[PDB]
Structure formats: C-alpha cells, structure tokens
Amino acid sequence: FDERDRVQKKTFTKWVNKHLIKHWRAEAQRHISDLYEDLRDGHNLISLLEVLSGDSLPREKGRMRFHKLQNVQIALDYLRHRQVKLVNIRNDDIADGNPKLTLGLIWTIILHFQISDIQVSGQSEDMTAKEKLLLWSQRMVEGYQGLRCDNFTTSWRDGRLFNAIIHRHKPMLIDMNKVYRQTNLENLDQAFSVAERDLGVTRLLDPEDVDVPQPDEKSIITYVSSLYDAMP
Amino acid sequence: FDERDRVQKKTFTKWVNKHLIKHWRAEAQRHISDLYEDLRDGHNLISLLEVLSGDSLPREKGRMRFHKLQNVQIALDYLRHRQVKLVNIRNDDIADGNPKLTLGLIWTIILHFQISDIQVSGQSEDMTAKEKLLLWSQRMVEGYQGLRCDNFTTSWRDGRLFNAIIHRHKPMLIDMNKVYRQTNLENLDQAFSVAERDLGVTRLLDPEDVDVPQPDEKSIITYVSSLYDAMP
Numbered sequence: 001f002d003e004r005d006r007v008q009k010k011t012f013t014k015w016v017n018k019h020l021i022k023h024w025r026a027e028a029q030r031h032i033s034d035l036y037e038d039l040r041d042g043h044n045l046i047s048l049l050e051v052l053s054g055d056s057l058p059r060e061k062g063r064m065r066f067h068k069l070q071n072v073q074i075a076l077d078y079l080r081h082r083q084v085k086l087v088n089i090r091n092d093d094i095a096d097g098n099p100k101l102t103l104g105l106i107w108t109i110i111l112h113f114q115i116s117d118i119q120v121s122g123q124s125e126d127m128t129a130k131e132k133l134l135l136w137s138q139r140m141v142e143g144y145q146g147l148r149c150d151n152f153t154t155s156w157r158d159g160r161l162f163n164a165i166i167h168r169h170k171p172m173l174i175d176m177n178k179v180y181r182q183t184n185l186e187n188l189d190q191a192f193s194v195a196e197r198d199l200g201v202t203r204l205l206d207p208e209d210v211d212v213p214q215p216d217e218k219s220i221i222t223y224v225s226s227l228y229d230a231m232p
Numbered sequence: 233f234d235e236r237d238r239v240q241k242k243t244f245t246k247w248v249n250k251h252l253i254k255h256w257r258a259e260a261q262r263h264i265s266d267l268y269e270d271l272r273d274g275h276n277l278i279s280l281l282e283v284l285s286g287d288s289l290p291r292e293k294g295r296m297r298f299h300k301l302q303n304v305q306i307a308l309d310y311l312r313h314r315q316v317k318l319v320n321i322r323n324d325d326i327a328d329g330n331p332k333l334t335l336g337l338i339w340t341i342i343l344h345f346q347i348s349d350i351q352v353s354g355q356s357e358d359m360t361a362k363e364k365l366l367l368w369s370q371r372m373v374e375g376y377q378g379l380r381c382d383n384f385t386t387s388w389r390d391g392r393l394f395n396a397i398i399h400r401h402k403p404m405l406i407d408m409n410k411v412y413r414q415t416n417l418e419n420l421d422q423a424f425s426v427a428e429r430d431l432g433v434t435r436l437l438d439p440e441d442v443d444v445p446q447p448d449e450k451s452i453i454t455y456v457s458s459l460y461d462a463m464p
Contacts, residue, residue, distance in 0.1 A: 087357050108358075128360060150382040 004216035005103070007209045009035050011219035012106045014204045019051045020044060035106070036097045042071025045094070049078055052113045068095045084112050107218055115225045133225060140165045146180070152220045157211055159187025162227075166194055169231050173198055184211040199230040236448035237335070239441045241267050243451040244338045250434045251283050252276065267338070268329045274303025277326070281307055284345045300327045316344050339450055347457045365456060372397045376408070384452045389443060391419025394459075398426060401463055405430055416443040431462045 013035045023029050028047040032038045039045045046059050057074055060067040072091040079086055086108065093101040116129045120136045127135070130152075137149045141164045149155050156162065160179055167174040173194050179187055188207035195201040204223045209215070245267045253261050260279040264270045271277045278289050290306055292299040301323045308326075311318060318340060325333040343361065350364045352371065359367075362384070369381045373396045381387050388394065395411045405426050411419055420439035427433035436455045441447070 085358055111358075128363070150380075150386075154380070 003212075004214065004219075005099070007205075007216040007219050008103060009099075010206075010209070011204045011216070011222055012103065012110070014202065015110060015222060016044070016048055016106065018202045019048055023047055023051050036099050036102055039102060040095055040097050041068040042073075042075055042094070045075045046071055048109070049075055052109070053078075053082075065095070079108070079112075082112075084108060110222055110225075114229070115221065118225070118228060130221065133221065133228065136228060137161070137165070137224060140168050143168070144176070152217050152224065153215050154213070156220050156224075157213070157215060158184045159189075159191055159207070159210070162191035162195070163187055165227060166191060166199070170198070195227060195230070199227070201226050201230045235444075236446065236451075237331075239437075239448040239451050240335055241331075242438075242441070243436050243448070243454055244335065244342070246434065246436045247342065247454060248276070248280055248338065251280055255279055255283050268331050268334055271334060272327050272329050273300045274307060274327070277307045278303060280341070281310055284341070285310075297327070311340075311344075314344075316340060342450075342454055342457075346461070347453065350457070350460060362453060365453065365460065368460060369393065369397065369456060372400050375400075377412075384449050384456065385447045386445075388452050388456075389445075389447060390416045391421075391423055391439075391442075394423035394427075395419055397459055398423060398431070402430065427459065427462070431459075433458050433462050 013032050016032050016035070020031070021029050028043075028050070030038075030044055030047070032044065043059065046057050049055075050057055055078075057078060059074060060070050069091050072094045076086055076089070076091060076094075086105075089101050089105055094105060111129065115133065118129055118132045118136065120132050120139070122135060122139070123132060134149065134152065141147045141149055141161055144164045144167075147160055147164055149161055159182075163174050163176065163179045167176055174190075179190075182190070185207050188205075188210050192203050192205065192207065196203050204226065205219060209219070245264050248267070249264050252263070255261050260275075260282070262270075262276055262279070264276065275291065278291050281287075282289055287310075289310060292302050292306075304323050304326045308318060308321065308323070318337070321333055321337055326337060347365065348361045350361060350368065352364060352368045355364055355367070366381065366384065373379045373381055373393055376396045379392055379396055381393055391414075392411055395406050395408065399406045399408055399411075406422070411422075414422070417439050420437075420442050424435045424437065424439065428435050436458065437451060442452070
C-alpha cells in the first residue's frame with residue numbers, strides 16, 4: 001500500500017469530474033464515484049474525450065461485455081488516431097477495472113490534453129513538458145526570499161510556492177507576510193480557496209494530502225498545470 | 233560567456249579522447265587538443281564512430297576542403313542511416329569549427345551511443361532517456377539519510393550523491409560518515425578518484441567545475457551515465 005496511489009486516484013477523479021459536467025449533452029454529465037468502476041463500460045471515457053476535444057464519437061448503448069469492450073476500444077482508437085502512445089493497455093484492462101492501468105490511461109489523457117501544450121520563455125527544444133512546467137514554476141517564484149522550486153513533490157508541501165505563484169500573478173489576492181508565519185495546512189488551504197474563488201481553478205487536492213513528506217508527483221503536476229492554464 | 237560551455241567542451245573532449253585510444257588501427261588513436269579544431273577534417277569524427285559502432289567506414293585521404301567536407305558527410309550520413317535525429321547541422325558547420333554545432337553533434341553522439349541504452353525496473357515507456365537515468369539515480373540513493381536527487385545540476389554539487397552511488401555498489405570503498413563531514417571539493421575529488429582507481433571510470437569532470445552554483449547539465453549526465461555503465 002502506498003498512500004500516494006490513493007491521492008492520485010482522488011485527484012484524477014476530481015479532474016475527470018470537472019470535465020464531464022461541461023458536456024453539452026445532459027445525459028453525459030455523469031459523476032465518477034469510484035474511478036475503477038465508473039469507466040468500465042466506456043461511456044464516461046468517451047464523454048471525457050468528447051469534452052476535451054470537442055469531437056463527437058460513436059458509442060454502443062447495449063449492456064453486454066461486448067458493448068463495453070467496444071466502447072473502450074472506440075476511446076483507445078480515438079487516442080491512437082491522434083498519435084497518443086498507448087502501450088501495454090488493452091481494452092480488457094479498462095473494462096475489468098485494473099487500478100494501475102486505469103490510472104495510467106487517465107494520466108496519458110491529462111498529459112496529452114492539458115500538460116503538453118505548455119510554452120515558457122527560455123525553452124530548450126529537447127525539454128519535456130514536465131521540465132517546462134518546472135521552469136515556469138521556478139521563474140514565477142524567482143523574486144521571493146525563502147523559496148525554491150526543485151521538484152514537484154517536496155518543494156510544494158508547505159504551501160508557500162502555491163501562494164507565491166498566485167501572488168506574482170495578482171499581488172492583491174495574497175498577503176505574502178502572513179504566508180511566511182502560517183502553518184502548511186493554512187497556507188495550502190488559503191492558496192486552494194483563493195485559486196478556486198478568484199481564478200476559477202477547481203480544487204483537486206486537499207491540504208491534508210499535500211502536507212506529507214512525499215506528496216504524489218502526478219497529482220501536484222496536474223494541479224500546478226491547472227494554475228498555469230488559469231494565467232493568460 | 234557562459235562558463236558551462238567551457239566545462240561542456242572539456243567534458244566532451246575527454247569523452248572523445250577516451251574512445252579514440254580504443255581504436256584498432258594505431259594511426260587512428262589520436263588525441264583531441266581543441267575540440268573546435270581537431271574534428272574539422274573529419275578523420276577523428278569517423279574514427280570515433282568506428283570505435284563506438286564497431287564498423288569500418290570509408291574515408292578520404294586528401295587535404296583540400298573537398299576532402300574534409302566529404303569526410304564529415306560520411307560521418308553524418310552514417311548517423312542518418314542509423315536513424316539519428318540530426319537537425320540544423322551541415323558539413324560546413326563542422327568543417328569550419330562552429331562551437332555550438334560541434335558541441336551539439338558530440339552530444340547527439342553521446343546520447344545515441346551511450347545514454348539511450350539505460351534500463352531500470354519500473355520505467356514507463358513514454359519515459360525519456362534522461363528521465364530513466366534520473367530514476368536510476370533516485371533509486372540508488374533511496375536508503376541514504378538527507379540525500380535527494382532532483383536534477384542533473386545542483387543536486388550533484390556537493391559530491392554526496394556521487395559518493396552514495398558508489399557506496400551502494402561497493403560499500404567498502406567509501407566511508408559515508410566522512411562524506412557528511414567533508415567539504416564539497418573533498419567529496420567530489422574522493423568520488424572521482426575512487427571511481428577511476430577501483431571502477432575503471434575515466435575522470436571526465438574536475439571537482440572545481442562541479443562545485444559551482446550552476447553545473448553544466450550535459451557534463452554531469454555524461455559522467456553519471458559512465459557510472460551506470462560501470463555497474464553490473
């Protein structure tokens with residue numbers, strides 16, 4: 001048991017749910033309760049992809065295993081036709097609720113549709129999307145006294161970076177002096193509540209899951225990438 | 233002027249020189265004095281590729297510009313023929329001694345022949361070569377108290393990671409308690425000396441070029457990759 005897999009699942013669940021409610025068809029606006037059950041018939045996975053891309057996709061409405069395997073295949077074929085690299089995931093794995101491969105698939109979707117469009121001044125061309133986001137993060141908190149961004153895990157635990165990023169962007173929203181004397185939990189909660197109320201950024205993370213010696217990397221990157229998106 | 237470019241040139245020169253002396257024809261066992269002069273005629277570049285690949289390659293012996301440009305074309309064609317992504321390099325650039333494009337070429341060679349070989353359990357497959365090497369480095373230093381590997385620059389500055397990677401494989405060679413007590417210069421000297429004496433790892437880096445606020449990334453990745461090769 002690694003608690004980061006729990007956090008990751010929660011974060012991806014909130015991410016998927018944020019998208020499904022934006023669907024234009026009212027019957028597609030569903031809510032994931034358990035990420036390892038509610039994608040098994042492929043319907044929410046096809047809906048997710050319709051919202052992220054703006055395309056319509058075909059789907060089967062029958063209820064046998066054959067229909068679920070096919071809905072999943074439609075989704076994975078869609079992704080393949082957009083040159084996403086899906087390796088070692090087959091339709092049965094998703095239809096059957098395999099935890100690790102379901103998490104792998106959603107990460108693949110987040111990476112392809114949200115993270116891999118990032119553009120930062122000072123970009124090398126051999127830089128990875130992750131590297132570009134870390135560079136963006138480092139540039140955003142450059143003026144600020146105690147602060148370093150070394151990674152997407154431990155650097156973020158104390159909530160100061162999240163606050164500093166939002167401050168840089170709109171100094172009105174954040175009292176930095178106060179950040180320097182508040183606890184981790186207070187700083188995290190303050191940054192997440194401001195980002196949601198004032199920037200439109202869905203709360204993907206709970207402070208209790210970030211204030212931990214080894215936070216889940218993909219969850220942090222997903223949230224940080226969602227802040228980047230909220231800044232013109 | 234960025235001092236890292238000086239370090240990178242020095243690192244790459246030592247890396248090229250370590251290979252040229254392993255050529256099977258004695259006449260090809262040459263020594264690079266200045267990397268921006270001594271590849272211009274193409275002979276050393278063809279020899280390097282011969283030793284890294286095991287293949288014999290054609291070569292021109294004349295001394296006009298025509299011969300130099302052709303020797304260089306033979307090398308770059310060989311590389312294209314092996315599906316190496318060269319972009320923005322011609323003939324002329326290497327024959328004229330272009331510093332940036334000469335460094336870029338050698339980096340492309342190091343990356344294709346030495347670094348892209350890495351394998352460690354629990355890779356993704358969307359994972360880049362550098363990401364695999366970083367994962368390896370993170371794993372190798374997991375048991376060690378206050379050590380973290382976040383990148384291939386500032387994490388390596390103090391010499392502790394080099395000393396830990398070696399201790400993990402040969403615990404008798406280094407005293408980790410002395411490591412936490414020493415200066416960066418001592419730690420780096422000791423790790424590179426031990427690596428060379430007992431593990432056959434050529435010293436590509438001098439301590440004073442690593443113990444700096446911003447170490448050259450490609451130089452460190454080159455050396456770390458050399459450490460990986462000298463393990464089981």
